[PDB]
Design a protein around this ligand. Structure first.
Ligand SMILES: [Cl-]
Length: 214
């Protein structure tokens, strides 16, 4: 009968892969079976992965996610006992796009911009960046985009005033986590063609309002 594989050891091989290896038990193991699952699920619902060598690469994993796993050998007598558990967390990767940009337009020159958190954060989001710029009718920039800097970049809304009347602008929003900046959500809008609705702004410090012609 085979003993348990020894020194089970796992290391992230990326944001969607883990490398798990162990020492062959003495005897004549024919192969190994690995059980692995997301932290918070269960061994009873484990994924089951066969290997003919004393290592495996776990694939199609979630980014920034803890996985638990263990491994047994099988041989002439069937499966031996499993190794002790190991836990390993995949790397972060950049977030997905923010949600579709929402514009609550106040006037011909003022709009609120807001967006939902990325559907996949793939890590811990530490900031958003909003850019905006004039475009012509083919979404071709007229001059450079402008980057907005704000006191709290984790906020998902911005007020923008002093936009040029009846001109289209491109707006973009992207999100950052520990892996870096993810892809941009873009929208092109002209306030002239939007429904107008009044806004109430509490008279308090640090309102995130951007002057578009400065
Ligand atoms: Cl990967």
């Amino acid at each position: 009968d085979l003993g348990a594989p020894q020194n089970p050891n796992a290391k992230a091989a990326g944001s969607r892969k883990i490398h798990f290896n162990w020492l062959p038990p003495s005897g004549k193991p024919m192969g190994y079976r690995v059980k692995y699952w997301i932290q918070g699920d269960s061994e009873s619902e484990a994924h089951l992965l066969d290997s003919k060598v004393p290592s495996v690469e776990l694939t199609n994993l979630y980014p920034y996610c803890d996985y638990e796993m263990k491994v047994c050998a099988y041989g002439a007598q069937g499966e031996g006992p499993y190794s002790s558990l190991v836990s390993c967390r995949t790397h972060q990767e950049v977030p997905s796009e923010p949600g579709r940009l929402a514009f609550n337009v106040v006037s011909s020159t003022v709009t609120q911009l807001s967006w939902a958190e990325p559907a996949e954060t793939n890590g811990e989001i530490t900031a958003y960046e909003v850019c905006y710029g004039l475009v012509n009718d083919d979404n071709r920039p007229i001059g450079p985009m402008k980057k907005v800097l704000v006191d709290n970049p984790k906020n998902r809304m911005l007020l923008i005033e002093n936009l040029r009347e009846s001109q289209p602008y491109r707006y973009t929003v992207k999100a950052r986590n520990g892996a870096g900046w993810g892809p941009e959500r873009e929208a092109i809008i002209n306030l002239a063609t939007q429904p107008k609705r009044p806004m109430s702004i509490p008279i308090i410090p640090d309102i995130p309002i951007v002057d578009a012609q400065s």
